Design a protein around this nucleic acid. Sequence first.
DNA 1: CAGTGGCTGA
DNA 2: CAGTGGCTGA
Lengths: 67, 67
Amino acid sequence: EKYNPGPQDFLLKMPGVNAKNCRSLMHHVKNIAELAALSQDELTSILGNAANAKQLYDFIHTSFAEV
Amino acid sequence: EKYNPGPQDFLLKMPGVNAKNCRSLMHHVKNIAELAALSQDELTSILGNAANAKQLYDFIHTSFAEV
DNA sequence: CAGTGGCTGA
DNA sequence: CAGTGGCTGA
């Protein structure tokens, strides 16, 4: 498909994303902007899995360094 | 000052990033959430380069399919 | 932002 | 989110 291996791949690079919920993610978000804009509740609603949701939401909110 | 290879490396995985503006980016954003929350005008203020800003914001604002 | 976890070997 | 483009060989 026309799904560029850039932002599309970026989704699967997360510890809570697979090709299965990837299609849902990209269809629910514009790109990286909406991807990181998603909330834990949003994730479960799109991914349909609490584990995948928490894992994805986790990385999105994983601070670079703990001071 | 950990800076795990997860969110930190994620920054350097962009077409408009380097290690020099990486320290600026992480200091201006919490993690991925703020990373994608940045605007093209903001990127220039952080990265200090229009090219890097446009390139970084480009990817952030890159549609999964049909860029 | 808007879609469901969209696949898989013989 | 909050820091400046934070480096580099002899």
